[PDB]
Amino acid sequence: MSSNEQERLLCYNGEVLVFQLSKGNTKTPILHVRRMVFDRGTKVFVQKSTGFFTIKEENSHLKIMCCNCVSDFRTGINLPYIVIEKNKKNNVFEYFLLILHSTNKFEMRLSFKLGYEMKDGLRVLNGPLILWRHVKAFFFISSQTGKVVSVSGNFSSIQWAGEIENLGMVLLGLKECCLSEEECTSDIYIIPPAYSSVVTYVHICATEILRISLIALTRKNQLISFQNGTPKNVCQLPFGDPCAVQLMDSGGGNLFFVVSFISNNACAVWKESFQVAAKWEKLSLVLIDDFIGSGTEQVLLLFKDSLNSDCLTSFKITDLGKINYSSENRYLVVPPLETGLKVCFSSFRELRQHLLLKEKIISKSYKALINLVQSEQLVEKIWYRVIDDSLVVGVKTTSSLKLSLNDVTLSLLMDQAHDSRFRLLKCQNRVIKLSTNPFKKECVQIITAVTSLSPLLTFSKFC
Amino acid sequence: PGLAPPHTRAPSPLGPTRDPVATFLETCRELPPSVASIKVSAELLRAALKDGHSGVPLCCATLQWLLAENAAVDVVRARALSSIQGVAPDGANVHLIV
Amino acid sequence: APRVRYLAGFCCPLGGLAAGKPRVLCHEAEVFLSTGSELVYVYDQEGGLLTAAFRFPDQVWHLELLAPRRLLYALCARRGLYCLSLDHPSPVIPVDPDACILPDAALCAFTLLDSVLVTLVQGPARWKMQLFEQPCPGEDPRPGGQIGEVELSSYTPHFLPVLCSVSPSGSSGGFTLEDALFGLLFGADATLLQSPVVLCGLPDGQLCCVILKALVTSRSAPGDPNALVKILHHLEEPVIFIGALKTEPQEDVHCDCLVAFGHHGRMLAIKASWDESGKLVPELREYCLPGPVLCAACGGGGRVYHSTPSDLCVVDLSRQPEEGPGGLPPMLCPASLNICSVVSTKLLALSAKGRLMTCSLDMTTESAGQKIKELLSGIGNISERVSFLKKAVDQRNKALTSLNEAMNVSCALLSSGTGPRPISCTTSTTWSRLQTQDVLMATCVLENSSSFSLDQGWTLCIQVLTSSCALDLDSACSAITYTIPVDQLGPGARREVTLPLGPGENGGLDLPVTVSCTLFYSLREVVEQEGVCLPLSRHTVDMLQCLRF
Amino acid sequence: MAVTEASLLRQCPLLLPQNRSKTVYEGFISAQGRDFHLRIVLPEDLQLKNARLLCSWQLRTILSGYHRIVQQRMQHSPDLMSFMMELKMLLEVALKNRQELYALPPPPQFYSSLIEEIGTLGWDKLVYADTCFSTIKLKAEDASGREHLITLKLKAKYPAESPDYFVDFPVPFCASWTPQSSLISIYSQFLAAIESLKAFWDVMDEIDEKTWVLEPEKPPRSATARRIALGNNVSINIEVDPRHPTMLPECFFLGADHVVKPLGIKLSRNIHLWDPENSVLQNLKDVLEIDFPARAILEKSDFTMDCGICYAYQLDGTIPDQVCDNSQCGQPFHQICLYEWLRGLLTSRQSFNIIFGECPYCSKPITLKM
Amino acid sequence: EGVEPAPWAQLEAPARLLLQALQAGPEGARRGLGVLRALGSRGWEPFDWGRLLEALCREEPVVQGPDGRLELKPLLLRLPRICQRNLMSLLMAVRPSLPESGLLSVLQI
Ligand SMILES: [Zn+2]
Ligand SMILES: [Zn+2]
C-alpha cells in the first residue's frame, strides 16, 4: 500500500521483499527494505537481510506506486524495481524509478519529473520502461532515452504490455490495433471483435507462425481461452470484479490460473478441465513463487491486516497438491497417510500416461479405417456464397477430372451436434463450363450446388 | 398406430419441442395427463344411432359413429373396441374411452 | 533442508528459451552461463552475486573451458571463435575481436582435448570437420596451423550437432572408456594407437565416429571420408546428448555404458556382453522414452538426469544385462534445460522461466494432527482430479466401442456374403397426386438386418441423377442430393422416406433415371480431410415402373 | 452372442480390428476397472498354432509364471474368442493372487472416516498400523488387567463389507457388521466376548501361576490344553471346555506304566468327588489325593529328545542322534526320518554316501552320513 | 522338464512344513499335532490360520482331462489326496480355533 508510513510487497526467486517508509526523525522518511524467506523448520518467516535508501528533501507526500521484477536491458537479468511519487505539493511531482541489486543497494534510473499527477493505467516493462496515460494521452519513457514520449495510435485503455519474439516491445489497447513503440504500428489473428466489446484484461501464453495462444476474461465474470483466435474452453467465476490473473505450474501438468478480484477474493482454476478448484476470501495480498526450495512454484495468501498492525502474520501457503501450510500418540499412522498420498499421485500421473495411449489408439484406428476402404488432386478448391436466402457451394477442378466419363455430384451434410433433430437437406447440382480467352486452350469446368439457408440458421451457426 | 392394420414400424412423429424461431431466440440468448369427459343418455344414443349396424349395445357403435369420418374406423368395426390411443396431427399421444 | 535454492533470474520471452542453445558450467566455486543469447555471465557459487558479465555479439552457441590455463572458450554464431582470460585485469564488460581467433564464421560445433582443438562446420551440402592445433605453451592465443579435414559424406541439409571426446586408459574434459568397449566399437587400430576418438551427433540424428591419430591430411593428401569417418547406427531422430557411464560401481572413472540420447526420446545404449559366441558381443538397446527431450547430464552411478517439457526426470541403469525397460521418475522440479551434474548427487541447472538454481539431493504433539490435517486435505485435493480423468476415460471407451461396431459394419458390407446382409435399402416407384397432377414419387426404405446398432455419427446420402449422358449444353439440374441424419437405427428396425423425382420445371421427365444411395461416417462427430463413405446400393427407375393403369 | 460377430464386441469391446480379412487387431482389454494393451496378428488363415502377439511390459510382469501357459493356449485354443476368454480368466486369477500389489481406495470415505472413528475410540487404544492401512490392530484390558489384542484386515471398502478379524482367544468369535456398525460397535462386541470367558482365563491364570506347566510354554490365549509335570519323569495332559471351565476336563498321563496305574485308580475311585465350585486344583489334589511340584526344576523341565519328524523315541531301537549344527534349533532327529525328508526335498543333493539339506525346523545346512 | 516344485513351495515356513508333515501317510495326522505343540513351544506361538486358509482357497490353473483344456483349482484340491484328508482330520479337532469366514468357502470347495 502507498503512503508515507505504508509499505508494499513483492516476491523474488524464492523469497519476499517488503518496502516500507520509516519516518526517520533530523531526516525525512527513509525507505527500509526487508528480504525474508519461509522457514520450513518452524513454518514462519525470518529476516535474511535488509537495506535502506535515505531521502534528502523536506517534502512529504513520498509515495510507493508499484513493484515487480523487470529484466533490465543492459544485462538481461530479472531485477526488482520500485516506483516513487515525490510530490513537492507544488502541483509538481518527480516520479522516481529505482532498481535494487544483489548488494541490497539501490540505483536510480529515471527521475522523469511530471508537473501534473498520474494515477493511472500505469505499468512497467522489460528495459525499465514506464508506460502510462492521463486523459486519452498514452506515453512511455525508457531509462535509455530518459525523456517523455507519446504513442502514435489513440486508444481507450492499453490493458496488456510486453516484449514478443521477432518484434521487440508491443502493446494491446484496441484488439483491432497492434502497435510497436520503436516504429509505432499485426492485426490478423486477434480475437473476435465481437469479444472486443467485453474483455477488460488479457494475459498471453505463447506465439507461433502469424498465430498466438492467449487467454482473456470479461466483465461477465468469465475466463476464456484462445488459440489462433479460436474461442475454446470458457469457464465462469464465483465472484465479480475480475482484477487480473497469473499462472502457476506446480509440477508436471498440474497447472493453474490464479485470478484476483477487486472484491478482495480470488479463485484458482485447473487446466485440462476449465473449472474452479479452489477459492479464497479477503486476501490482503497474493504472490507466486517457490518459497520452499521444492523445485516447483507455490502460492501465498495474506489475510486482512484487521488482525495486527503487522503484515507477515496471517498467512497461508498451498500448492493445492501435496503442500498445505498456515498460521495421544497419533504417530503410528502418518507413514500410511504419506504412502496412500504418494501412491494416489502416482496413479494420477499414470492415468494421464494411459489416457494418452487411449487417444493414440483412437487416431491409429481412424487412419487404419480410412486405409481399410483402400492419390491425385481431383479438386483445386472449395468456395461458396450466399445470394439472398439460397446458399451455394462450388468447386474449381482440374484436367485430372473428366466429366465426359464420370457423372458427378456434390452433396452437403450437417454435423448433428448443433442441429440435434431429424430433417432433410436437399441440394441442386449444376455443371458450369466456361472458356477463357479464345480470342490446348483453357476450358474451366466447375461444379456446384445450391440449397436454402434460413432453415439452417437455427443455432445462429452451423458447420 | 396402436390399432394399425399393417402393424408397420412407421417411426414415432416426435413433434418439434421448439420452433426454429425460439431455438434461435434461446440459443443466441446466453406431469399429469390432462383429462376431460362427458356423458349422455343410452336412449338418446340408441334412438339417434340405431340404424342397427349390428349393435354392440353402446360405447362401440358410439365410437364408430364418432369416427365415421376418420378412415381408420372400419378397422375398429372389425376390432369392436371401446377405448384406444390415437396420436395427433401435432405431436402428443392421446387416449379416449367410451 | 531446502533441496533447491534459486540464485538468479533473467530476461525470458514467451513460449520459452531455446532448446539446446543455452549452456552452463561450473569450475570449482565459479559458475559460467550462457542464456543462448549473445551474453555470458559469471557468478560466485557461494554467493549468488555476480563477478563478471561479458557482452559479445552474435548469439553464444556452445561453451568450453580449461582449468589448467584459466581461460574460457566461446563460439559466437555467425562469426567463429573467441577466448578469454579468466583473471581479466557497472561491472559489465564488452569484448573486442583482439581476443577473437579463426573467425571462420560458418562453423557450428567445437570440442576440446587437453592441448588439441576440433571443430565441425556447415559448408554447402557436405559439412566438414577440421582438426586444429591448440598452443600448449603460455602463448599468445592461437590455433596454429590446422592438420586435417574431412567431408561428412553422409549428411545433406535451430539444431546444433554435438561432439564428444573419448580416450582410453593410461593417458581431459572428455569421457574415458574401458578397453573392452574400445575393442568393441572402434576396431583394432585406435586401441593399438591409444588414439583419442571423437563422436559427432547430427541434426539428421545419424552418428559418426572418427580417429585423430589417423586424421592428418594435407594438400597432397586429402581426407577421404570413406575410411577415415564411419557411422555407428542411424538414430533416426536428431541428436541431443552423448555420454558414457559407470555400471557395477564395485575422476578418471572408466565407463562401460555407452549413452546416446535423441529428441523425441529414442535413447540408445550399448555395453559389452562377450557371451554366447566365445567372442566379444555388443549388448544393444533402443528405448522409447517420453516427450520431446531437451537436456541431459550424468550423475554418479549410472544415473542420467534429463528433462521433458512436463517435468525434470531421471533414469538409473545400475545393475539379462542392465535393463529391458526405461522406467523413470521425476524429482518434482519443472521442465528444465541447461543442466550440469557434479559428484560429492548435487547438481546445477536452469529453469525455462530463465531462473538459475541448485539441486541438492538425498515428533511434535498437536502439530502431529495438523500434519495429518494437511495430508487429508491434500488427498482430497487430488481426488476430484482423479475422478475427472476417470470420467473422461469413460467417454473415450464409449467412443471406442462405437468405433468398433462401425468398423464391423463396414467390413460386413464390403465383404459380400451373397448379399450385403447387415444393412439393406430398397426403393419403390409410387405415384401420387398433388394440387392438380399425377406426380411420381419414390419410396426409400432402410432396414437393419443385423445386431450392429448404427448410432450417433452416421448419416445417409442419396443422390438422384436424371440422365446417363454428358452434353454440349450444360443442363440446369444435373442431379439432386438428399442427406439425412440416421440416428439410433437399432437392429431389426427400419427407416423410410419418399422422394419427388417428378417433373417440376416445364413438364420434364426422362427415363433411364437412377437413384444412388450411400452412407458416410464421421470420426469427428462422435466427440488430409477425414470421413469415409459406403456405397450400399443402386437402383434404376425406368419406364416400366411408372405406367399407371 | 453364439456366433462371434457380436460376442467378440461384447467380450473384447475395447479391442478393434485394423484389417479387412480380419487378422490384425489391437487395443485395450479390461479387467477389474483397469485396461491393458495388446497388439495381435494372425496369419492370413485364422489359426492360432502360429499367431504373433505382443503386449505391454506392465502385462508381461503380471503374466510372469504363465507365459508357458499362454504359449500353449495359443496352440490349443481353436478360436480367438475361446483364447481371450481363457486369457481374461487367467488374468483375473493372477491379479487376485498378486492383489497385495494393487490397491486404490476411495480415500475421503476411507482415511477421513477411519481417523474420525479412531479419534472417537481413543488414541490410547491404538497399537499398530500398516502403511497400506489395510491392516491394523487394537487392544483391550480385562478388569483383571489382562491385555488381549485383535487384528483387523480391511477390504477396499470399510463400511460396505465386514473387516476380517483375528483375535487371541480360541472360540470362534463373531460380531454383527452393519454399514452402521463401526470400530466402536465391533469393539463393544469384542469387549462382551472378553468377559464371556473370564472364568477360563482365571482358570488358566491359576494353572500357569502355581504349577509346573510343561509345554504350552509361554502359552497363548487360544491354548486350551495344559501339559503339567508332576513328581518326576511323569506328566499329565489335560483339556478344558471354557463354557464349563470349572468342569472336569479330559485328562490322562504319560510316563512309566507302574507309576501310571495307581493314580489312574485313585482317579477312577475319587472322580465322583468332583466339585466344580472350588479351585480345579482343589478338586485335583483331593481326587488324585496328592500335592504337586511347584516348578520342581524350573530350569531343566524337559529338553525333549523326540524325533521331531515322528515325535518318537526308540525308532526300531534307533535314537534320534542326528542333530542340527545350530544354537537356536538343536533339535535331535532320526537317521531314516531325516533321510526320507531330505530325499523328497528338491533342494537336496547326493554325494557318494553323505547328503546335505535344510533342517526341517530352522532351514539351515544339515548333513546326514549313512 | 519332468520335475515340478512343491505347490506349497512359495509360502510361510511353518505352514509349508506342516504340509510336508501331513504328506507323511496316516501318522502325518498326529504329526500335525506335534507340529503345533512344537510351535506353541517355539518363539512364534501365534500361528495365523487365517493366512493359511486364504492360500488354500486361492486359485491357480491346470491343464487336465484332454491336453487341450484349461481349468482352475484352489490349492486345496491340486495338493495330494493324503495331505487333504489328513488336513481335514486335523481341522475337525482344531475347529474351535478357526475363522468361519474362511471355513465356509473352504467347505464350498
Ligand atoms: Zn523318527
Ligand atoms: Zn535346525
Swiss-Prot record, chain A:
UniProt-annotated location(s): Nucleus
Disulfide bonds: none
Keyword Hydrolase: no
GO cellular component annotations of the record: chromatin; cytosol; Fanconi anaemia nuclear complex; nucleoplasm
Keyword DNA repair carried by entry: yes
A biological process term (GO) from this entry: positive regulation of double-strand break repair via homologous recombination
Keywords in alphabetical order: Acetylation, DNA damage, DNA repair, Fanconi anemia, Nucleus
Biological function: DNA repair protein required for FANCD2 ubiquitination.
Clinical note on disease: Fanconi anemia complementation group B: A disorder affecting all bone marrow elements and resulting in anemia, leukopenia and thrombopenia. It is associated with cardiac, renal and limb malformations, dermal pigmentary changes, and a predisposition to the development of malignancies. At the cellular level it is associated with hypersensitivity to DNA-damaging agents, chromosomal instability (increased chromosome breakage) and defective DNA repair. Some severe FANCB cases manifest features of VACTERL syndrome with hydrocephalus.
Quaternary organization: Belongs to the multisubunit FA complex composed of FANCA, FANCB, FANCC, FANCE, FANCF, FANCG, FANCL/PHF9 and FANCM. The complex is not found in FA patients.
Protein name: Fanconi anemia group B protein
Organism lineage: Eukaryota, Metazoa, Chordata, Craniata, Vertebrata
Boundaries of the shown chain within the full protein: 7 to 594 of 859
UniProtKB/Swiss-Prot annotation, chain C:
Keywords: DNA damage, DNA repair, DNA-binding, Nucleus, Phosphoprotein
Cellular localization per UniProt: Nucleus
Cellular component GO terms held in the UniProt record: chromatin; cytosol; Fanconi anaemia nuclear complex; nucleoplasm
GO molecular function: DNA binding
SS bond list: none
General function of this protein: Plays a role in Fanconi anemia-associated DNA damage response network. Regulates FANCD2 monoubiquitination and the stability of the FA core complex. Induces chromosomal instability as well as hypersensitivity to DNA cross-linking agents, when repressed.
Complex and partners: Belongs to the multisubunit FA complex composed of FANCA, FANCB, FANCC, FANCE, FANCF, FANCG, FANCL/PHF9, FANCM, FAAP24 and FAAP100. Forms a subcomplex with FANCB and FANCL.
The protein's name: Fanconi anemia core complex-associated protein 100
Organism field: Homo sapiens (Human)
Protein's gene: FAAP100
UniProtKB/Swiss-Prot annotation, chain D:
Modified positions (N-acetylalanine) in chain numbering: A2
SMART domains in the record: FANCL_C
Assigned EC number: 2.3.2.27
InterPro entries: Fancl, FANCL_C, FANCL_d2, FANCL_d3, FANCL_d3_sf, FancL_WD-rpt_cont_dom, UBQ-conjugating_enzyme/RWD, Znf_RING/FYVE/PHD
PTMs per UniProt: The RING-type zinc finger domain is monoubiquitinated in the presence of UBE2T and UBE2W.
Positions of Zn(2+) 1 binding: C307, C310, H334, C337
GO BP annotations, alphabetical order: DNA damage response; DNA repair; gamete generation; interstrand cross-link repair; protein monoubiquitination; regulation of cell population proliferation
Alphabetical UniProt keywords: Acetylation, Cytoplasm, DNA damage, DNA repair, Fanconi anemia, Metal-binding, Nucleus, Transferase, Ubl conjugation, Ubl conjugation pathway, Zinc, Zinc-finger
Mutagenesis or variant effect for I265A: Impairs interaction with FANCI and FANCD2
Entry's localization field: Cytoplasm; Nucleus
Pathway: Protein modification; protein ubiquitination
Pfam family membership, one: FANCL_d2
ZnF region ranges: RING-type: 307-363
Reaction it catalyzes: S-ubiquitinyl-[E2 ubiquitin-conjugating enzyme]-L-cysteine + [acceptor protein]-L-lysine = [E2 ubiquitin-conjugating enzyme]-L-cysteine + N(6)-ubiquitinyl-[acceptor protein]-L-lysine
Keyword check for DNA repair: yes
GO MF entries: ubiquitin protein ligase activity; ubiquitin protein ligase binding; ubiquitin-protein transferase activity; zinc ion binding
Statement: the UniProt record of this protein carries the keyword Ubl conjugation: yes
GO cellular component annotations of the record: chromatin; cytosol; Fanconi anaemia nuclear complex; intracellular membrane-bounded organelle; nuclear body; nuclear envelope; nucleoplasm; nucleus
SUPFAM superfamilies named among the record's database cross-references: RING/U-box (SSF57850)
Listed result of changing W341A: Loss of interaction with UBE2T
Name of the protein in question: E3 ubiquitin-protein ligase FANCL
Record organism: Homo sapiens
UniProtKB/Swiss-Prot annotation, chain E:
Post-translational modification: Phosphorylated.
Localization terms from the record: Nucleus
Job of this protein: As part of the Fanconi anemia (FA) complex functions in DNA cross-links repair. Required for the nuclear accumulation of FANCC and provides a critical bridge between the FA complex and FANCD2.
Subunit structure as annotated in this protein's UniProt entry: Belongs to the multisubunit FA complex composed of FANCA, FANCB, FANCC, FANCE, FANCF, FANCG, FANCL/PHF9 and FANCM. The complex is not found in FA patients. Interacts with FANCC and FANCD2.
Disease: Fanconi anemia complementation group E: A disorder affecting all bone marrow elements and resulting in anemia, leukopenia and thrombopenia. It is associated with cardiac, renal and limb malformations, dermal pigmentary changes, and a predisposition to the development of malignancies. At the cellular level it is associated with hypersensitivity to DNA-damaging agents, chromosomal instability (increased chromosome breakage) and defective DNA repair.
Record's protein name: Fanconi anemia group E protein
Residues of the full protein shown: 12 to 120 of 536
